[PDB]
Amino acid sequence: LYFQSMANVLVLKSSINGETSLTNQLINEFLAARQAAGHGDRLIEHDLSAMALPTLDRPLFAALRGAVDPQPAIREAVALSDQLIAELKASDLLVIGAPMYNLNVPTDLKKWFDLVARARETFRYTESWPQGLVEGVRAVVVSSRGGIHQGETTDAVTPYLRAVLGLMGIQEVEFIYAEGLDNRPHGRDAGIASARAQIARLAVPA
Amino acid sequence: FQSMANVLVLKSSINGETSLTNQLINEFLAARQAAGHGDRLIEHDLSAMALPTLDRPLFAALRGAVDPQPAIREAVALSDQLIAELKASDLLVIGAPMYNLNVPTDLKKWFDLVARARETFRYTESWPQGLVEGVRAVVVSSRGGIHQGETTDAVTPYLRAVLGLMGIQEVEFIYAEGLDNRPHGRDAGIASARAQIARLAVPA
Numbered sequence: 295l296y297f298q299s300m301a302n303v304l305v306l307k308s309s310i311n312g313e314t315s316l317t318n319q320l321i322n323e324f325l326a327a328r329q330a331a332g333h334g335d336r337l338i339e340h341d342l343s344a345m346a347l348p349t350l351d352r353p354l355f356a357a358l359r360g361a362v363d364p365q366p367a368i369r370e371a372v373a374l375s376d377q378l379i380a381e382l383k384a385s386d387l388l389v390i391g392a393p394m395y396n397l398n399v400p401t402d403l404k405k406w407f408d409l410v411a412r413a414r415e416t417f418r419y420t421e422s423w424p425q426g427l428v429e430g431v432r433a434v435v436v437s438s439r440g441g442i443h444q445g446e447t448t449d450a451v452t453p454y455l456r457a458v459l460g461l462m463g464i465q466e467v468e469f470i471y472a473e474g475l476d477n478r479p480h481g482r483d484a485g486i487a488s489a490r491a492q493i494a495r496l497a498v499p500a
Numbered sequence: 501f502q503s504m505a506n507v508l509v510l511k512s513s514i515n516g517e518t519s520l521t522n523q524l525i526n527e528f529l530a531a532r533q534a535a536g537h538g539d540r541l542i543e544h545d546l547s548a549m550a551l552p553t554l555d556r557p558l559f560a561a562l563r564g565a566v567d568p569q570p571a572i573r574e575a576v577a578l579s580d581q582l583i584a585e586l587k588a589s590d591l592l593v594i595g596a597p598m599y600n601l602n603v604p605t606d607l608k609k610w611f612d613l614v615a616r617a618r619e620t621f622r623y624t625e626s627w628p629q630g631l632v633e634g635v636r637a638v639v640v641s642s643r644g645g646i647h648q649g650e651t652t653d654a655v656t657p658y659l660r661a662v663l664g665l666m667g668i669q670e671v672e673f674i675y676a677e678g679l680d681n682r683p684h685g686r687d688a689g690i691a692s693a694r695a696q697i698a699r700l701a702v703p704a
C-alpha cells in the first residue's frame with residue numbers, strides 16, 4: 295500500500311552553479327519538507343547542466359515532428375526526447391530549478407522544453423488552440439534572482455514557464471521565489487526566508 | 501561612404517532559406533535602402549555558428565577570470581568579438597521568431613555571451629549602467645499564434661529588458677502575428693509586417 299501510494303516526482307535542475315546552487319538547495323529543501331509533511335516521493339532527478347543537451351536545429355526539429363532521420367546524433371537525441379517525455383507523462387509532480395540568467399531561464403532548461411514540447415507527443419493541434427497531452431501533472435518552479443543589482447527590470451521567466459507548461463497541459467503551476475538576493479546587506483537572507491515560507495506552505499498539499 | 505549606418509544583423513531562425521524572419525530582415529534592409537539610407541552590415545547567422553552554451557567555467561572566464569583552457573579561451577575571444585561588433589554598430593537588427601514561447605536558443609546564446617559585466621554593462625550600488633552607447637534596435641519576430649499555443653508574449657518584454665541591461669533602451673518590433681490562422685493569416689501578418697517595415701525604414 296505505502297509504496298504503491300507514493301507520489302512520483304520529476305526533478306529538473308538547470309543551474310550552472312553546481313554545489314553552490316541556491317535553486318538546487320531550495321529544491322532539496324522543498325523535497326525534504328514534503329517528506330516532513332508525510333509524503334513519500336519517487337524521484338527521477340536530472341541535472342540538465344551535466345547532460346550536455348543538444349540545441350534545437352533544423353534536422354532535429356524535423357525528426358521530432360515525425361520524420362525518419364537517420365543521422366546517429368539526431369536519432370540519439372530523439373531517443374532522449376521520447377525518454378524525457380515518458381518520464382514526464384509518468385510523473386505526478388514536476389519540480390524545476392529556474393534561476394534567472396540574463397532575464398531568461400538558463401539555456402539547459404530551455405533545451406529541455408525544446409525536446410519535450412513536441413507536437414503529437416505532449417500536445418496535439420486543434421481547430422483553435424493546441425490540446426495538452428500531459429495529464430495528472432502539477433508543477434512547482436523554484437526561481438531565484440539577484441534583483442535590481444543584476445538589472446531585473448521585468449520577470450519574463452515566470453510567464454514564459456506558465457505558458458510553455460500550459461501548452462502541454464500543465465495548467466496548475468506554483469512558484470517559489472527567492473527575490474532580491476544581491477540587495478546589501480539582508481537580501482539573500484530575506485529571499486531565502488521568503489522562499490522557505492513558500493516551501494513550508496507549499497510542501498503540504500500532496 | 502562615411503555617411504553610412506553600421507548595422508549588425510542577427511539571424512537565429514532554424515528554417516534556413518525558408519526563414520520568414522530572415523525574409524523580413526532582408527525586406528527591412530531593402531526598405532532602408534529605398535529611403536536613402538546606405539548601410540554597412542555585419543551579418544551573423546547564429547544558427548550556423550554553433551555557439552557555446554554558457555556553463556560554469558565559461559561564466560567565470562567571462563567574469564574576468566584567468567582560464568588557460570583552449571575551448572574556453574576561444575569562446576571568450578568570440579564573446580569579445582561579438583561585443584566589439586555590437587559597440588561599434590549604430591543599428592542592431594535581430595531575428596527572433598517565437599519557438600516554444602521563447603526566443604530561439606541560438607539568439608539566447610548570443611545574449612549569454614554579449615550580456616557581460618565590465619563589457620556591455622557595469623555594476624553599481626543600485627542598478628547596472630549600460631555601456632553600449634548609440635545603439636537602437638529593431639526586432640523581427642514572426643509568430644504562429646493561437647494554433648502554435650501562443651497564450652502570452654514573453655519574448656517582447658524579455659528582449660526589451662535584456663537589451664536595456666546593456667543600454668539599448670530604444671527598441672521597436674516588426675510583428676508578423678497570426679501566421680497559422682486559416683486561410684489568410686500568413687498573408688495578413690506578412691502584410692502587417694510590411695507596413696510596420698514601411699514605417700520604420702524612414703527614421704535613419
Ligand SMILES: Cc1cc2nc3c(=O)[nH]c(=O)nc-3n(C[C@H](O)[C@H](O)[C@H](O)COP(=O)(O)O)c2cc1C
Nearest residue numbers: 309315316317393394395396397438439440441444
Ligand atoms: C549568468 C548569470 C546571469 C544572471 N542573470 C540575472 C538576471 O538577469 N537578473 C537577476 O535578477 N539575477 C541574475 N543572476 C543572479 C541569479 O538569478 C541568482 O544569483 C540565483 O540565485 C542563481 O541561482 P542558482 O545558484 O540556482 O544558479 C544571474 C546569475 C548568473 C550566474
Ligand SMILES: Cc1cc2nc3c(=O)[nH]c(=O)nc-3n(C[C@H](O)[C@H](O)[C@H](O)COP(=O)(O)O)c2cc1C
Nearest residue numbers: 513519520521597599600601642643644645648650
Ligand atoms: C520549434 C518551433 C517552435 C515554435 N513555437 C511557437 C510558439 O510557441 N508559439 C507560436 O505562436 N509560434 C511558434 N512557432 C511558429 C513560428 O513562430 C513561426 O512559424 C515563425 O514565423 C517562423 O519563423 P522563421 O521562419 O524565421 O523560423 C514555432 C516554430 C518552430 C519551428
